[PDB]
Amino acid sequence: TQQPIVTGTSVISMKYDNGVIIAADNLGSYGSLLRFNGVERLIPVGDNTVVGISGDISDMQHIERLLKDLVTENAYDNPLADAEEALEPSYIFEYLATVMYQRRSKMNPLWNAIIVAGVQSNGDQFLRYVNLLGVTYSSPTLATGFGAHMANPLLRKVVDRESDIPKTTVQVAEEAIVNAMRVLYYRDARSSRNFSLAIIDKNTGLTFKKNLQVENMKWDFAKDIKGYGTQKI
Amino acid sequence: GYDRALSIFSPDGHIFQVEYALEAVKRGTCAVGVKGKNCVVLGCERRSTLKLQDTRITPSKVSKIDSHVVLSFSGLNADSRILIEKARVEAQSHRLTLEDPVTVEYLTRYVAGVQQRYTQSGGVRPFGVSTLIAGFDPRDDEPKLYQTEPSGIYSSWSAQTIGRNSKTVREFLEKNYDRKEPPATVEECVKLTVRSLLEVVQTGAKNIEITVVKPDSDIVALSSEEINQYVTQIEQEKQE
Amino acid sequence: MTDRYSFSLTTFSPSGKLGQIDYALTAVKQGVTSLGIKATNGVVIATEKKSSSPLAMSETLSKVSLLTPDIGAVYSGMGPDYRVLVDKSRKVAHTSYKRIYGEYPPTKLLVSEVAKIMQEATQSGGVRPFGVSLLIAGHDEFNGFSLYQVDPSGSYFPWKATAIGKGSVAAKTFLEKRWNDELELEDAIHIALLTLKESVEGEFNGDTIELAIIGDENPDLLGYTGIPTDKGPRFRKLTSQEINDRLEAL
Amino acid sequence: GSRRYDSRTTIFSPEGRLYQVEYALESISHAGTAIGIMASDGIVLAAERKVTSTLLEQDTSTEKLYKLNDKIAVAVAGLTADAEILINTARIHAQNYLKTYNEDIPVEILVRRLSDIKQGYTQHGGLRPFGVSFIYAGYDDRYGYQLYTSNPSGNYTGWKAISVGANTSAAQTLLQMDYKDDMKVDDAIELALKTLSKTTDSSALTYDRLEFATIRKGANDGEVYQKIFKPQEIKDILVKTGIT
Amino acid sequence: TTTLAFRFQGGIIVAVDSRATAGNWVASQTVKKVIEINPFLLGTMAGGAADFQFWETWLGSQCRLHELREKERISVAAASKILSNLVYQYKGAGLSMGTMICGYTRKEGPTIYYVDSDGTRLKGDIFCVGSGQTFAYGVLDSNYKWDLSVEDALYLGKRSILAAAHRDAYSGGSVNLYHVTEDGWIYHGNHDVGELFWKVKEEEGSFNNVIG
Amino acid sequence: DRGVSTFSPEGRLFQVEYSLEAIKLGSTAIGIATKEGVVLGVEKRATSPLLESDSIEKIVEIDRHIGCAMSGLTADARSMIEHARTAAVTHNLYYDEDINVESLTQSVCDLALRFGELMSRPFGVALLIAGHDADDGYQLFHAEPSGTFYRYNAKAIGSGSEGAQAELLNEWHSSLTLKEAELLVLKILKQVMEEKLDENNAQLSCITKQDGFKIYDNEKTAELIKELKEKEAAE
Amino acid sequence: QFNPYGDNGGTILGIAGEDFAVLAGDTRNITDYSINSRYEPKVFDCGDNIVMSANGFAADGDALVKRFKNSVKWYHFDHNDKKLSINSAARNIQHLLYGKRFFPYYVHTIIAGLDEDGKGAVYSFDPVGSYEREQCRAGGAAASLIMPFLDNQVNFKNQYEPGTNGKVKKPLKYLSVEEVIKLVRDSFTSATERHIQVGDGLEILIVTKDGVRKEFYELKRD
Amino acid sequence: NNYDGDTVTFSPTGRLFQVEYALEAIKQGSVTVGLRSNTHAVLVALKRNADELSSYQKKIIKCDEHMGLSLAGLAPDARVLSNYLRQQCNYSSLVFNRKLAVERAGHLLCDKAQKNTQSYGGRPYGVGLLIIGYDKSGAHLLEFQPSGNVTELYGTAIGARSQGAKTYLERTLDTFIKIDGNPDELIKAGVEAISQSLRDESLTVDNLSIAIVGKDTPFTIYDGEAVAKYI
């Protein structure tokens, strides 16, 4: 049993017709202090999987090392390490899910919420969630922390059920994700303007986008707001 | 720890360490067990090479395992103490958990199990001891007499002997003991036990020990004078 | 791996001999001569510093060792075995005595602890006996001055005077003629030097001879003042110069 | 592997004997003779030190007779170092029993414990047995004065008079000849010394070659005293009995 | 929970209710509170349901091993002590158990042992365990005799559970009856309390307070 | 000396091959499987007339549906039986059902090769394990100290094994009744035994679906011996 | 302080027919007032004509189902591909649950299938392993809403025959698979209306001698 | 000679005799054949009986839905190694939701057998195994020796008189490799191959044992009247 110290906030994600999108801001908070502004919380594994992590950063860095070590180990005595016997999103997730549940069962959890996004060998979209309790679930849209409360509602308007996935293009999906990140910046007190976004497509592969910023923000209406009720000036 | 396999098979299918443990029993002083109709008697030889002994304190050959069961033996004296101790502990453990004293068969099975364990455990040699376990089951008046040996096999006997010159006294018992009509009284059973030892013992002075066990935890050891009277009566009848 | 030698390497032979102990005593016999003499007001222990090479600094190799402030030791036989025994002897004097009673052990009990370690190497699994015989000299309040010998078997005997190693048979005879119960410490040192000269072939001086005494308390060697009851160590190793001074009156 | 070098100390011979026990007994037969004699009013322990020297410090020396508690003592025959290991174990058992039951340990219970330890070394562990034979002289309020002996096999027996070590055959014959049941301590003292004087391999029996002890009720009123004899006291009893 | 068991001339009567509650919620009305350890031994359920099911099924395994090894039926004393010694090892851990180990052997006759998760083991003639035990005790104590018939004894046990089922909120559902003889136990049926209450009320004239 | 788990140049484990020689010295045990049941029979072989023969327990119950007969160093079999009984009962506890005869045999045979430098040597005893389950019906197995077990329609182990097996070769057929099997065990036991066969120095037992495992009384066996004598004298 | 348990909501329902058995469960997965997934399968085919669901804390529920599926696999290896009977599966699950008696799987488990006589069977477990064969059992969040309805409409409790006035009970006539599915659907529709953790979708697994069949139905998503 | 007392001892020519004696136990064992195409992999095993009353010793063991082996030598050792494979296959499924690769299964068997050849006290395994399987890279056939050596092959045979079947497969190499989408014809080739190792005795209904795994075919064993088709 511990308490989380340096923390990362929402990770958001969704499926589209040919793959999956995942995003997370670049902030490492220290309570109310916005301590570290250059933290990458999307960690790619191979060319077909991206693991997005929120919660305790020290535990994230541990998980990051486990995944790095997993790729090394898979290559050992494996001529098809970059082909048929490469690491799948489903393999990477199940490994993490095992670790998370084992650690909670020893009363010493990895204080995180994790979303594994990727594309399988047969082109199928993979998107599944796991957290410090070892709880797992899948859905067309997935989000951690504040994202669950604010992002999912917006992303579910695009893909409300399974049958909406083939109807959703990568442009529409990315637009919804970027808009969600803006909303989280308006309303999450432990968020930052800078973020990273990753697209895993079955045709065009892994596209990792760094140093993105929230833009097209509405603040002008603030000038008209005065006082807290009766005040006119 | 010391893990060496001392008891092992040989090409002809024998475990020599178990067989050499029997040779230690052959060297040991003679012990005999005879069960009557309502009693069991345990006879034991005391070699008279050792005089100037203190018979008060010297370890007696027959040992009480519980108030209703006794154990005599032939072979290594030091080894017998370990079996007796384990048996005594198991007897109290059985009373504690089952709320009933051990049967003679159960106690025998336990001791035989310990002996067997030492024939296929690493770093240990077999017990150089064969035992005669006798007594009466709780609330039962049927006499019980069992034998064990280093290998771990055990069985029930109408009458049996173990130790040095046991071949001779077994020869005697085989012709003198009738199954259809065993020694009806305590006297008859003790007499037959002393007679069988007199085939081997040498002198009937302090060389013979007798212990009579009866139902309902009634165990008593005979004194020198009491035994000497049996020795006198046997030889006087023989002079004819 | 694992130490799979869990069985005794010292066993009784048909004749009743414990071979490895006998052979250990044979190794002690080959060793350099060392001796001990007890006086009325002290004890002396001495041995030859057999230098393996003239390039070697024989001062660094200490054959005579302090075990406690009032107890010293010397040996004959295998030096490395002696060195580790001194380390164990020093530690056991603390762990099994000083940390319990708040004072250093008496000579006989420390000897007893050393003997125990040597006995165990004679019976425990996967080990040979120590190839040394020790002469332990010491003093304590209630027993006074004392001198003990300790063999590879673990057996120990108290001596008025004795010798071990190369020329022990001749040396013991020499000590029998000279020893009496009215000897002062200086007289015992004088006799020790005479006795040791017989077994030495080459050079005989303060640089080739190692000699220490258990005598009066040395407040100058204590290292601090202010506590009346702490009067300093009775063990003192004689210097090269101090030995040579007594060799002139020899 | 290591099997190659294993002597196998805990095995039977084809004849059914324990090799190492038999060879340990052979070792003990060369040790200094120790004699115990039990009387109605006490017990005597006499023992011969092996070929001593004139430079041996006798008054502070102890190789034969050891004290286990206030009521029980032992005479040693064999490896002195091996005996001291067992002696310290026995001293602890006596104190454990005293702590538990708040009563001094009965002699036989102490003897059985030590004998069981010796037995263990012959049946398991792969180690050599202790090359030691004890004579236990002790007293308790159940059996009174008691003499026992134990040997490396772990077997122990009770005695009125007994010898261990060298020349036991000759010694046991001499004791069997002159011993009587109504004997007293002062007489037993004389018998013990006379027996050693005849069986000794030395030219003459002197005070410096002996250790002596008595367990007497000869203490002020109902209690028991152990007396380990001093060199001068052994010299006096040698003159008194008329040996020197 | 209401469970009882009492010794009498014709052996032992065991009677239990059938209700299981989690707070105010009635989880089940058809619970089996008598374990059939083997054809000659019975055990009752009070407190923890899993603890009872698990460990008394386990007890049946130990009793089977006993008679395989000893070639003889296990005594009620020995069987009860196996269970009491087991729960005693777990004392403090939070096991919840209150059971009557009931049996009929040659050497003992009809025997009942109350066994507890506190390690208590008591031999006795009458036992009642559960939230409705006091109600059952009232009917038992006033009507019990050693010389009851098997028919009357069975009814007394049935009626005593009914008494508790009525008053105790955490007892009810149905009544299970057993009769233990030397040749083994005999099941005497499941009796719905709903139907039994009205049947008893009319035939016995009892429960005049209640309108029917 | 040499390792306990050593291979011979022929590719066999010395200790296992030597334990088989000990089993050859053991008393004869015979098993015959039929569609009406499996029969188990043994030679008691008392070393002296004073030995009460009824205390010789070479046929043993494992569960109600599984029996067992032994041959060789019979003391070694006690821990094997203990494990078998525990395995049978434990499986019933975990799965609320009888345990398959094969599965029970496999559990016993897993102990066999757990020896080295675990126990110090292999078992010096062979077992005939007979039983019934719903899946494979009536079964007879032969469990060796090598860890190998064969299923048999009929099998003999012990000193008179090769002679008895040759006799079982001719006599066994798939339509044998239980009564026919009982007499056949007695016939072959009598043939290979040193002493004359009677109800005191030989024992019978069987396992049926209805009644389970049963050791035969000396009175019951005596009648089957008398029935055997008459039918042999009949031609 | 770290709390190793959580509540994922959901509701499950098992009903045993004459020669069939159904095990139903909603597909909604939640924490607190948020929806994690609108379709997260909760009832599983475990092989050997057995269906299983472990409702409550989903991590423990997934762990248990995973371990039982594993137990079925090893039962085949160890016992010559023998079919694991529903009663044997039930006992096995007790030992899995009681194995963690002092750190329990925080789930209410239900399995369903056919017994060895071919009749419909449902078994119901508590978190620490106490189990029992039942004809009818709802489990989870809306269990208190559903069970009374099933007592009334399956077992005809408190229902009597007109004209007799409380004297003659309504006879316990057997329900067909079509009739049971109607009661399951109405149970979940009603539960969805009045319980916030129930909704999104209903998934039913039907077990017969022919095998395991699946049926899915929409539920209100508010 | 002097260097065969235990597995820890090299001979003067650099040989491990205890391993070679364990290898000899395989040659004494009954013949078994393994072969594969691009779609399917087949095991054919000649089972051995003690006598006419006895059953025929089972030779084939299933390890997973997609993998299994046939044995030749000490059957208890095959049980130990097959049990280990079952666990490793099962660990891969539970932890990684991943079917264990046949090549990786061979690597694990090699390393387990190796530890028994370098340490004092233990002994080498006395059995040879033929592992077949269908994974993400198609059909596979492995040959395991208790020295530790594992070899991936198109076809092979181990046991007594195995050289005859091994030569046949070496001739038929080009034919049977092409048998794709036809399980019956691939088994026929396996049955014809094992027939080259027979003397005196012939393939009967309770003598023959066949197993197959493929693209849309779980590892299934055929015994009894199920193999009468191929006799």
Ligand SMILES: *C(=O)[C@]1([C@@H](O)C(C)C)NC(=O)[C@H](C)[C@@H]1O
């Ligand atoms: C009875 O003891 C009881 C029953 O629910 C179980 C099924 C035995 N246990 C309880 O904890 C509650 C309070 C019931 O009385």
Ligand SMILES: [Mg+2]
């Ligand atoms: Mg709702």
